[PDB]
Amino acid sequence: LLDEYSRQRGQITAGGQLLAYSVATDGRFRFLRVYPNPEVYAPVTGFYSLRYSSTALERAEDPILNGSDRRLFGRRLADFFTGRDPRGGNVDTTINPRIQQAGWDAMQQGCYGPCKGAVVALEPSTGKILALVSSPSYDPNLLASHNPEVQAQAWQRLGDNPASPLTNRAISETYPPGSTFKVITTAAALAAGATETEQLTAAPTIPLPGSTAQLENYGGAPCGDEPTVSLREAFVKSCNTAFVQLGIRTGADALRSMARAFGLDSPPRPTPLQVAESTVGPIPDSAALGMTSIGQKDVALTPLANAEIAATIANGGITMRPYLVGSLKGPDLANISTTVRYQQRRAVSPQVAAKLTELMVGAEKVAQQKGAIPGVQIASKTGTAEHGTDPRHTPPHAWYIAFAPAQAPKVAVAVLVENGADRLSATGGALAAPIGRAVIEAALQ
Numbered sequence: 200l201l202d203e204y205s206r207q208r209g210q211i212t213a214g215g216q217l218l219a220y221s222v223a224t225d226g227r228f229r230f231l232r233v234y235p236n237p238e239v240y241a242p243v244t245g246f247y248s249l250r251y252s253s254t255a256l257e258r259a260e261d262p263i264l265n266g267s268d269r270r271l272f273g274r275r276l277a278d279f280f281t282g283r284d285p286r287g288g289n290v291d292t293t294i295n296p297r298i299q300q301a302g303w304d305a306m307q308q309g310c311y312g313p314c315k316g317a318v319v320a321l322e323p324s325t326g327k328i329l330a331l332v333s334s335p336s337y338d339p340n341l342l343a344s345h346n347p348e349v350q351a352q353a354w355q356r357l358g359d360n361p362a363s364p365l366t367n368r369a370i371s372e373t374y375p376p377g378s379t380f381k382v383i384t385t386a387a388a389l390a391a392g393a394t395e396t397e398q399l400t401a402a403p404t405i406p407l408p409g410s411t412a413q414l415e416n417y418g419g420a421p422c423g424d425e426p427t428v429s430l431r432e433a434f435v436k437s438c439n440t441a442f443v444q445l446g447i448r449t450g451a452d453a454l455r456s457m458a459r460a461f462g463l464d465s466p467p468r469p470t471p472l473q474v475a476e477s478t479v480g481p482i483p484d485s486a487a488l489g490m491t492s493i494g495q496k497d498v499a500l501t502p503l504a505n506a507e508i509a510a511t512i513a514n515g516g517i518t519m520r521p522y523l524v525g526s527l528k529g530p531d532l533a534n535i536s537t538t539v540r541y542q543q544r545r546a547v548s549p550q551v552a553a554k555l556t557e558l559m560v561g562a563e564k565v566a567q568q569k570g571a572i573p574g575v576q577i578a579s580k581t582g583t584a585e586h587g588t589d590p591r592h593t594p595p596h597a598w599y600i601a602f603a604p605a606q607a608p609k610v611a612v613a614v615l616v617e618n619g620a621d622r623l624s625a626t627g628g629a630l631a632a633p634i635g636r637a638v639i640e641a642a643l644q
């Protein structure tokens with residue numbers, strides 16, 4: 200470890216700004232690891248600690264940053280031969296500083312106090328991860344202290360903290376998507392030949408097939424005053440029973456297939472950070488399909504996967520493989536690796552993506568306009584999702600997935616407010632949407 204810290208570890212950057220760097224000190228271990236904006240960028244940088252090793256990009260990009268990478272071997276030979284102070288390479292992330300900061304700020308101020316949860320922002324056309332925010336976060340400088348008691352004290356606090364600040368909730372945790380999954384259910388129906396004009400129950404209540412359990416609209420009210428409403432109307436109002444019906448209408452196989460087509464239940468590629476796989480669930484019977492269609496039962500998404508659903512639709516039905524590293528550089532800033540966009544797959548046809556765009560543009564119009572950007576057409580879907588063993592008595596997760604401008608999209612976001620500000624009245628529109636809108640606003644400057 201003394202030799203590792205004798206040489207200058209390279210930089211992790213975003214938008215030509217520093218997220219992690221090393222300063223030369225008078226320490227036994229010469230180089231101190233510094234994180235100038237610690238909590239904001241901790242999901243991205245992770246930490247690099249004498250006692251506790253590394254995480255995130257400090258771990259993922261370790262050989263580049265310490266200079267042991269075989270693509271850097273030539274520089275290291277040239278350094279020694281010339282008597283130059285050896286330096287590691289740079290990791291240039293895809294993170295947009297202003298979108299990352301606004302996502303962080305909005306999470307700190309958005310739950311009458313700080314929110315628990317995640318914000319992910321994507322560039323739909325490229326797959327760039329523009330923002331990767333998790334809250335609560337932690338200070339990596341604590342773990343970069345060359346003092347062992349400071350590190351040990353921080354480690355003990357972090358691991359005992361029930362709010363689990365070390366968790367990157369954007370990529371490591373999966374959550375029921377709730378009403379946001381109506382985007383998948385709608386895609387499956389649309390691809391099976393249903394139209395925006397399809398007539399679905401407006402009833403406040405719907406029995407589940409083969410069970411006493413019942414699903415209800417919020418809160419026990421019909422979708423409208425007619426016995427049936429159009430799919431479009433049901434979608435913009437986010438009427439539960441309409442989608443229970445539609446999903447059971449469309450059937451298990453078509454829903455499984457559309458969930459797979461949108462990245463669910465296939466192991467995600469690394470970013471190079473490892474992403475938890477999201478799932479639609481086994482869907483054992485029709486009761487389960489009922490609940491699945493509205494984003495419950497065994498449906499579980501990472502925030503990143505939910506933002507990819509939005510990025511896919513925004514990209515005309517084409518999913519770009521998400522990545523966090525734009526380029527790897529050498530100490531002399533010489534390029535070593537430029538990541539290039541690639542199309543993972545086609546989830547929906549261009550026609551279906553266009554129909555979903557319109558439905559989401561309309562769902563955004565129904566939602567509350569707190570945070571609405573003057574003259575920007577946002578396409579969105581909100582969701583508020585039950586979870587845990589006592590779902591009806593627990594504060595739900597607040598969800599918001601969006602893209603903008605819906606006409607020619609430059610950014611897609613997912614906002615997960617975990618346990619919805621610890622409020623039981625929490626909804627995606629109330630909490631998650633303005634947060635979402637703030638990030639979109641930071642993106643479009």
Ligand SMILES: *C(=O)[C@@H](NC(=O)/C(=N\OC)c1csc(N)n1)[C@@H]1N=C(C(=O)O)C(=C)CS1
Pocket residue numbers: 376377378379415416417436437438439493494495580581582583584585595624625626627628
């Ligand atoms: C979508 O998931 C749906 N939400 C619910 O029905 C709720 N729990 O079961 C999933 C629920 C609990 S509290 C609350 N407001 N909703 C619909 N989602 C929204 C939405 O867009 O966020 C609605 C406005 C209508 S209910």
